Design a protein around this nucleic acid. Structure first.
Ligand SMILES: [Mg+2]
Ligand SMILES: [Mg+2]
Ligand SMILES: [Zn+2]
Length: 600
DNA sequence: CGGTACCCGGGCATA
DNA sequence: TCATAACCTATAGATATGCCCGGGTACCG
RNA sequence: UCCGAGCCGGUUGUCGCGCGGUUCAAUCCCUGGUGCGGGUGCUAGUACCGGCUCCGCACUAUCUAUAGGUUAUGAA
DNA sequence: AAAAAAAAAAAAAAAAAAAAAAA
DNA sequence: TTTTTTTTTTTTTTTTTTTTTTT
């Protein structure tokens, strides 16, 4: 819910021009960054070591113990019985990890706050990674082992004879996923390939709630599947499949944002005793370090700054906390017709890859937001070219290209990764210490914010200050197709919500396959024009590209005798938007979706 | 040389 | 197949108070 | 491995058109926007403003880390 | 006899709903 | 009653076979 919000600002503006305080901030975050970096690797190192006998039950204490051992080492003297047990178990491995990596204990004082944030954040990473991807990888494992891609090509489609494999797969999947209890009558008929897959999944020992499906169990207790997820990665490595990061690692050497709260502020920045700070208000204590009078720290929507920020030496994120905090199908236009009628103007958007947004209204005013426009305004490609050139000058590209894979689940393989990373850590650390790397992150945010701000401003001047957006439901969220490039599809819904612009979803079925002029898909033609490939590397290779954004209608009524082409050309994005307006117009009038676009 | 008593501050627990 | 940036998308969490005890100091016998 | 947008045509609501022409906009420094006031600045006239630009008042804009897919570079 | 350009057809990847035969 | 698979939808790309033309 709307209980927290953030306002990013630059390091110079956020903090007062005090050299001493600023230097302490940079030094403190650097130490915390190192602890987080090695802690994540140390956690994986411990898991890969103890997995030979018994898989550890990773818990918040496990991550906390690793962080404390890296900082204090044997000097850490926890009083809780549970934490003490982890200290003894983990101490031998942390010392061994330090020797391999050469890390020296910072012995930082008053790190309790930093450890808690890192422990909670890192523990959250374990839950989310397993929660949202255990099913994905397991299903992918089944397909790769059976080579479903090979079977599809080898076995002709739409043939009753070959339907047995897909029907066979369902029975196999149910047994593997424990949806159906295995029985002798079926196991005897398993082919050797199927039998091998059965044993491998059984070795994973998937937790399974008898009263709920497997998917529900993952959501209910995702961490219970962590032992299986790590062991699943081993199968990928064994068979050469594309490995996945079972255990998250903070590999990046660039300055990562470190949360700084009131407790950390006085202990490290002001360097004053706890009693001295307790006698001063939290807001007053911050004013001696940060310029709270600036725009970022001002309250919004009843949310006030509560002495919690994250900084990385170039940008500062200011968090506003609501007092009511925890203290540590409906979006479719069909269900929102009354709102659309009262809307001053309705704009239909057809998302695409090159044309991220293609907007049209009843007046026919066309507006688009292209990927090239975003790249130039955002400067991502400009930064990418500069970043690549800078690496070549420093020679770091040759170093990073040969780093052993960190996704390996083998102790020996992971040890090589640490040794290689340690071998050139100094040179790469110096290269990444340059302000440019952090500035690009901050400059990218400014450029991205301005680019979106101009988009809204341009749209408002194009269609009006207040308008309703009916955006197509198409989106490749998290599943970008091969080739092409990443594009913003579902993020525009949030952006419109932020700008108080109503956003509604509309089905795109047959929106790009019906001619609006005649409302018929019988005479619509596609993929009829061909030209040399637009991609320069493909063009030199001699490959040819087929025009996709150009459509045409051969219906005689849409034709004119003067044309030698014989078809009324239509732009794909323009054609889709026009059809959407027809769909919206019919729905508003109460006639529902046109039968031509019906899925029926 | 021996034992009591007071205070500050660091460090650790906990929801 | 691997590594290093980025763009997007999804998840979870987004601080503070109380207590123990070690070191230093003072005091009398 | 390269890329901006708007407009006039070849076009007929036509194409990553390495088709022609035409107007601006950013390549560095920068948290963004809306409104309500107040004030050095340059482009015309002998009572009046589209502009870009910084001061105070309000409102508004959620990020960090990890992970999946993709892109660029360096390696197989 | 040989080679190059353009048209035609197909496949690949993720997912939405809708219709169907089988647990 | 309930369920997983196949078909038609967006977007964009990639891939192979064939004929016509030129040499
Ligand atoms: Mg569409
Ligand atoms: Mg489209
Ligand atoms: Zn038509």
């Amino acid at each position: 819910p709307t209980l927290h919000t953030c306002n990013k600002t630059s390091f110079a503006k956020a903090f007062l021009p005090n050299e001493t305080y600023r230097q302490r901030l940079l030094d403190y975050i650097a130490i915390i960054h190192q602890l987080a970096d090695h802690a994540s690797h140390a956690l994986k190192f411990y898991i890969l070591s103890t997995s030979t006998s018994s898989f550890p039950v990773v818990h918040e204490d496990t991550i906390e113990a690793i962080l404390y051992l890296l900082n204090k080492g044997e000097a850490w003297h926890p009083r809780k019985e549970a934490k003490k047990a982890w200290r003894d178990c983990l101490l031998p491995y942390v010392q061994r990890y330090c020797q391999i990596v050469g890390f020296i204990h910072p012995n930082l004082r008053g790190e309790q706050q930093s450890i808690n944030y890192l422990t909670v954040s890192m523990m959250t990473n374990l839950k989310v990674n397993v929660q949202e991807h255990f099913m994905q990888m397991l299903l992918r494992y089944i397909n790769l082992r059976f080579d479903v891609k090979g079977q599809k090509q080898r076995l002709p489609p739409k043939s009753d004879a070959r339907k047995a494999f897909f029907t066979r797969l369902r029975y196999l999947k149910s047994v593997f996923l424990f949806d159906v209890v295995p029985e002798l009558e079926f196991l005897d008929d398993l082919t050797p390939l199927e039998s091998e897959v059965l044993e491998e999944i059984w070795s994973l020992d998937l937790p399974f709630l008898p009263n709920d499906p497997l998917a529900y169990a993952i959501v209910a207790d995702p961490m219970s599947f962590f032992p299986a997820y790590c062991k699943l990665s081993g199968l990928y490595e064994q068979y050469g499949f594309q490995r996945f990061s079972a255990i998250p690692l903070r590999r990046s050497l660039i300055q990562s944002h470190v949360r700084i709260d009131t407790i950390i502020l006085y202990q490290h920045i002001l360097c004053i005793t706890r009693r001295d700070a307790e006698t001063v208000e939290k807001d007053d204590l911050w004013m001696r370090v940060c310029n709270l009078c600036t725009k970022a720290f001002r309250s919004r929507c009843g949310m006030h700054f509560e002495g919690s920020i994250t900084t990385d030496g170039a940008s500062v994120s200011v968090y506003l906390k609501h007092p009511e905090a925890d203290k540590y199908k409906a979006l479719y236009v069909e269900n929102n017709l009354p709102a659309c009628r009262a809307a001053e103007n309705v704009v239909v958007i057809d998302p695409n890859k090159r044309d991220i947004l293609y907007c049209q209204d009843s007046n026919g005013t066309t507006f688009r937001y292209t990927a090239n426009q975003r790249a130039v305004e955002t400067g991502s490609r400009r930064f990418a070219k500069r970043r690549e050139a800078m690496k070549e000058e420093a020679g770091v590209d040759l170093i990073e290209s040969r780093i052993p894979s960190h996704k390996t689940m083998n102790l020996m393989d992971f040890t090589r990764y640490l040794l290689v990373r340690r071998a050139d850590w100094d040179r790469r650390k110096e290269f990444y210490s340059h302000p440019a790397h952090t500035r690009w992150k901050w400059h990218s945010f400014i450029n991205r914010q301005k680019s979106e701000s101009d988009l809204i401003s341009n749209m408002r001047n194009k269609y009006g200050e207040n308008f309703t957006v009916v955006m197509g439901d198409w989106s490749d969220a998290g599943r970008t197709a091969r080739f092409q490039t990443s594009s913003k599809t579902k993020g525009w819904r949030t952006l419109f919500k932020r700008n108080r612009i109503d956003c509604f979803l509309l089905d795109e079925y047959k929106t790009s396959s019906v001619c609006p002029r005649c409302s018929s898909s019988e005479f619509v033609e596609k993929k009829f024009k061909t030209r040399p490939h637009s991609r320069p590397w493909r063009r030199r290779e001699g490959k040819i590209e087929k025009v996709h954004g150009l459509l045409g209608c051969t219906n005689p009524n849409c034709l004119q005798q003067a044309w030698t082409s014989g078809m009324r050309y239509w732009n794909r994005d323009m054609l889709s938007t026009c059809n959407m307006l027809l769909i919206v117009r019919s729905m508003l009038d109460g006639h529902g979706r046109p039968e031509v676009f019906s899925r029926s």
